[PDB]
């Protein structure tokens, strides 16, 4: 039944896995340093490996200068055997979470833990490794999604994605935090492979701070950005300004409607177009 | 302090296993606890009756020669509550989805829910589309499920982002061809909802679309806004910013700019005459 | 090759426990390590002094008859760094929130932060709204916290998405009534920020909104763009795409299309006369 370590003194009760490389050498990159897993009963035997598991793995070869280590969680899909178990959750050594559900990556790529390592594993991929260390990556066939299920209860269904801007840093000892600075952006858009590589977003919606903030003044804009056919340059086209003006983002450049996409009727207090 | 451990000196792996069976040597069952690791804290003169924080390995379907299904959950106990009210907040499904279900999101009865399919079975009125299973992250929260992206500037700029990354090909097979973004690529940010019978497709959205195929010197895009009319169930493109930067209605001679009691104050255009 | 394990042949669960106490048989404390599992790699002639990758169970509040609070963190060590600089990158809070805090996001001192409330206590100048605790995912990163949605086409189409899912009712109680999307349903995608005193509500946003209540034959929506003016702290609806697809200002006789040095090039409309 139950089983356990007890520390009565007030210290910690910790379980360790100790591993070495071949012939007392340093433990290696992507070596399984430790594991915990369930093995289910088939009727007369257990499965040959874990069907669900926690794995601790080496990140780079160990040395006096590298103690690199990362984590994955493995699951087995219903109707599949342990041959087809999936390392669906990967907490990278950089601190990124990769979520890779069933059907997203082949077995061969089970040790992929970053853009850098994905690039090495799939030479044609060429994603920007500058994105490593930024947060969550989801890889799924065709349609990777985030679903935000929001039952009303007695309030209102109000799911949200919220950027939170600030000046300063939480990384140092001082930890100064201050007012949103000018140049603050929140981009929601799409990058893609161009046949050679992934790069910057090429179409987007962005919330931007309209200058610096203070307690009585927090100005924003919402900007829509696209890229033209024959071009690789994402540009601001139309925006809602801080004062609420819907405006083109350059003077005398962008049209409202076209020949075969004409506005039905325009409603404006002033009947004359200001030129 | 009271450390404890397995050691493999040879170079092999040091792994801890949990072995479980069904009743009377039968196959282990669906949602059966196959293994667990958990802390039990000291109350003064006893420990808690169960773990207050735990990792659980669970069966997905009854085990057979054809099914070795298994999934994971992580359990926490909220401050000011007892283990009676512990929360399986993190659920890594057998399909590979992560479900995040914070305190107050789901009743105890739904602690074994690991998919839309299983949620549909547990709550018959729910009827979400199970086609969404296997797609990634699901967050269930009372009223306001959120993602917060906290972005301290440092010496650069506060630049939080949500980034779709389009490509041709597949990472799933042995060949693993990857290529240029294809026409018909989309990134939808919108809302589905229950219509009193079921959840379905998004009914209002902003979308980034590829404007055809991409190549090294040409990566065209559009931003489209889509809504659904009263008395209708059909989400339609209404207004978009085209690749060349034109703000346009998405159909000819259909949509107005402004209305009788929502009039633009003044229109600024270089050409003072409306092109009909 | 090595292995090690518990076996329950009877059909019961094989569970591993960690038992911990406070000092002198007292209650176990807030943020006390209640249990841990960790790898310790070989340096050539010794192991590392602590785990380089680990699962930790931790107290949330001091334990009592009324509090059994516990939470979870996962720790990793970045390549090219020693265990001195290991990162508690994954934090599943006692409230059930997931915090994702990659390398370089937070100092060592903040390793035990598990909520906005605790972050606020640790960094007094921070002042984020604790009303956001319990809502789901938080990502903290230097400058650019991101979510990447990598979408290989295969034989279909690259269609990454962020999907709100509105419903009436609750999954939290025993009844678990679920029903039609209600009026006042919203999906906000926008930015809050520090104003020099605190974080507060979003100050610029895009929102998908239900245009009233839904039924099986009627699921109306709008897309609204909201900004805040210089010298003001009030986020206001400015322009929206209505359910019938009208692009409209959100107040009558208030907002302009274009300005003096930001003029529309040419306006295309079927009717050449502006309806006043």
Author numbering:
A (entry chain A): 989 to 1263
B (entry chain B), C (entry chain C): 988 to 1263
Give the original sentences from the paper that presented this experimental model.
The well-studied Siphovirus T5 has a three-fold symmetric tail-tube, to the end of which three long, L-shaped fibres are attached. These fibres are made up of a homotrimer of protein pb1 (pb stands for “protein band”). The L-shaped tail fibres are responsible for the initial recognition of certain Escherichia coli (E. coli) host strains, binding to the O8- or O9-type O-antigen of the bacterial lipopolysaccharide (LPS). The bacteriophage T5 L-shaped tail fibre uses an intra-molecular chaperone to fold, which is then auto-proteolytically released to yield the mature protein.
The data collected by Garcia-Doval et al. for native pb1(794–1263) and pb1(970–1263) was also used in molecular replacement experiments, but in the case of pb1(794–1263), no density for extra N-terminal residues was observed and the remaining part could not be refined to satisfactory R-factors. In the case of pb1(970–1263), no satisfactory solution could be found by molecular replacement. However, we did collect data from a new crystal form of native methionine-containing protein, and refined this structure at 2.3 Å resolution. The structure of pb1(970–1263) resembles a bullet. In the mature, chaperone-free structure, the third interdigitated region does not contain any regular beta-structure, although there are many inter-chain main-chain hydrogen bonds. In the mature fibre, we do not observe density for the catalytic Ser1264, suggesting that this residue is removed with the intramolecular chaperone domain upon maturation of the fibre.
